[PDB]
C-alpha cells in the first residue's frame, strides 16, 4: 500500500546522513590535515570509498517504487561496477587500516620501516587496483534484461549460464565478509592482548581507563562491522538455497537489509574521524 513512497525517505536518509558525514570527513582531511601522515591517507580512502557508494544509494531506491531500472543501459553497467568496486574498496581499506594498526602496535620495531607515508599510499593504490581486479568481472557481465514490463539491471553469466554467476555471490561472501571479519577480529585481538601487556597502559587508573577507551573503540568498530554486514550477506546466501515465499513483509526488511548493509559506510565518519584526537586540532 502506502509503504512504497514512505520507505524511500527512511532509505535515502542513510544516503543523506552518510553523504554529509563522508563529505565532512574528506573536507576536514583536505582542509586541516593535508594528508601529511599515514593515517589520514587511509581515513581519506575510507571516506571517499564510503562517499561514492553512499551517493549511489538513491539509484537502488527507484527499483522498488518504479519497479524498473529507469536509468537506461547508460547507467546500469557503471553503477553496478562502482557499487561492487567501492564495496570491496571500503572493505579493503578497513582491512589495510587494521593491518596498519596491528603493525604499529604489536610489531613496533618494523613499524618504523613499513608505515611511512609513501608505503601507505602505495598499499592504498594496491588495494584500489585489487578491488578493480574483481570488480571488472562484475562489470563486464552487468547486463540489462527486460522483464514483463520494466527496464531491469542484473548480471547474467557466460557459459555455463546459471552457475558462473552463482560463483559471484559465494565469492563476495568468502572474500568480502569471511576474510575481513577473520582478519580484523584477530588483527585487533592480538593488538588488545599486546596493549594489556604495556607498562604505559597497564596500571595507573587514568591510563587504565585510557586502555579501556582503546578497547571500547576497537570493540565498537568490530561490532558495528559485524552488525552492519551480517544480514546483507546471510540473506544473500539464504536467497540462493531456498526460493523465499513472496511474503509482503519481506521486501521492506530487504531494503532495510540493504540499508544496514550501507550503515557501515554511513557510520565510518562517526566511527573514525569523530572518535579520535585529530578532530580536536
Amino acid at each position: 500500500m502506502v509503504t512504497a513512497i514512505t520507505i524511500m525517505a527512511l532509505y535515502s536518509i542513510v544516503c543523506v546522513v552518510g553523504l554529509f558525514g563522508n563529505f565532512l570527513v574528506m573536507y576536514v582531511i583536505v582542509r586541516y590535515t593535508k594528508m601529511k601522515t599515514a593515517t589520514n591517507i587511509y581515513i581519506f580512502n575510507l571516506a571517499l570509498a564510503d562517499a561514492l557508494a553512499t551517493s549511489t544509494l538513491p539509484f537502488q531506491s527507484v527499483n522498488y517504487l518504479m519497479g524498473t531500472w529507469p536509468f537506461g543501459n547508460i547507467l546500469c553497467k557503471i553503477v553496478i561496477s562502482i557499487d561492487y568496486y567501492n564495496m570491496f574498496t571500503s572493505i579493503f581499506t578497513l582491512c589495510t587500516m587494521s593491518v596498519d594498526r596491528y603493525i604499529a602496535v604489536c610489531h613496533p620495531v618494523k613499524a618504523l620501516d613499513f608505515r611511512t607515508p609513501r608505503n601507505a599510499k602505495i598499499v592504498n593504490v594496491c588495494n584500489w587496483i585489487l578491488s578493480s581486479a574483481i570488480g571488472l568481472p562484475v562489470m563486464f557481465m552487468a547486463t540489462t534484461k527486460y522483464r514483463q514490463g520494466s527496464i531491469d539491471c542484473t548480471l547474467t553469466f557466460s557459459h555455463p549460464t546459471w552457475y558462473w554467476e552463482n560463483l559471484l555471490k559465494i565469492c563476495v561472501f568468502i572474500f568480502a565478509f569471511i576474510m575481513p571479519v577473520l582478519i580484523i577480529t584477530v588483527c585487533y585481538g592480538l593488538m588488545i592482548l599486546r596493549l594489556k601487556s604495556v607498562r604505559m597502559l597497564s596500571g595507573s587508573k587514568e591510563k587504565d581507563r585510557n586502555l579501556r577507551r582503546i578497547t571500547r573503540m576497537v570493540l565498537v568498530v568490530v561490532a558495528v562491522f559485524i552488525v552492519c554486514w551480517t544480514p546483507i550477506h546471510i540473506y544473500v546466501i539464504i536467497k540462493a538455497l531456498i526460493t523465499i515465499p513472496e511474503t509482503t513483509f519481506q521486501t521492506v526488511s530487504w531494503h532495510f537489509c540493504i540499508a544496514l548493509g550501507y550503515t557501515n559506510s554511513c557510520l565510518n565518519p562517526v566511527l573514525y574521524a569523530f572518535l579520535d584526537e585529530n578532530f580536536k586540532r
Binding site: 531500472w69 557499487d83 542484473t154
Partner: peptide, 5 residues
C-alpha cells in the same frame, strides 16, 4: 549490494 538482483 543486495540491490540489482
Amino acid at each position: 549490494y543486495x540491490g540489482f538482483x
